[PDB]
Write a structure and sequence with these properties.
Elements lengths: L3 E10 L5 H5 L1 E5 L4 E11 L9 E6 L4 E6 L4 E5 L8 E10 L10 E4 L2 E10 L2 E6 L9
Antiparallel strand pairs: 1-3, 2-3, 4-5, 4-8, 6-7, 7-10, 8-9, 9-10
Bound molecules: the ligand COc1ccncc1CC(=O)N1CC[C@H](C(N)=O)C1 and zinc ion (ZN).
PDB class: hydrolase
Keywords: crystallographic fragment screening, XChemExplorer
Assembly: monomeric
Length: 139
């Protein structure tokens, strides 16, 4: 679990969005596994605006932050799970690292700020849903 809190927005994995997030929906995209809902309070996370390919992510299944190298956002085949059938997920970045289903929501950060959140993984990989292209998160 986990979310990014920037301005009056809350960014979560779409598959983990609550019925309360859908009522307060701003934008969602099933192909990216993202949902953004509006908040009453102002958030303080800064979104990165960069092309960094190294960063640090939080892994809740190890209670540890790990440094990683990750691929640029791309269209990647993601195996079936209880939340989606087997499909291509867009704007996804992969790294070699540990992840379990419940690690979704953990933040990936670089020197510039938040890059994205854990969204996919298994078999020694971890995938992150990029948020750096969502320029409107800053307004
Ligand atoms: C961190 O994800 C995992 C880690 C280990 N085995 C499996 C997984 C993958 C997983 O459970 N999901 C839930 C839906 C999500 C998606 N974006 O399609 C992928
Ligand atoms: Zn960066």
């Amino acid at each position: 679990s986990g979310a990014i809190y920037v301005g009056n927005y809350r960014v979560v994995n779409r598959h983990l969005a609550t019925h309360n997030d859908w009522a307060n929906l701003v934008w969602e995209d099933s192909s990216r596994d993202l949902l953004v809902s509006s908040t009453t309070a102002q958030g303080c996370d800064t979104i990165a605006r960069c092309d960094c390919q190294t960063g640090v992510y939080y892994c809740s299944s190890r209670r540890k932050h790990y440094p990683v190298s990750f691929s640029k956002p791309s269209l990647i085949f993601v195996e079936a799970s209880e939340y989606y059938p087997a499909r291509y997920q867009s704007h996804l970045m992969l790294a070699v690292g540990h992840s379990e289903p419940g690690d979704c929501g953990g933040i990936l950060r670089c020197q510039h700020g938040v890059v994205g959140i854990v969204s996919t993984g298994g078999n020694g990989l971890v995938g992150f849903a990029d948020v750096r292209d969502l320029l409107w998160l800053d307004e």
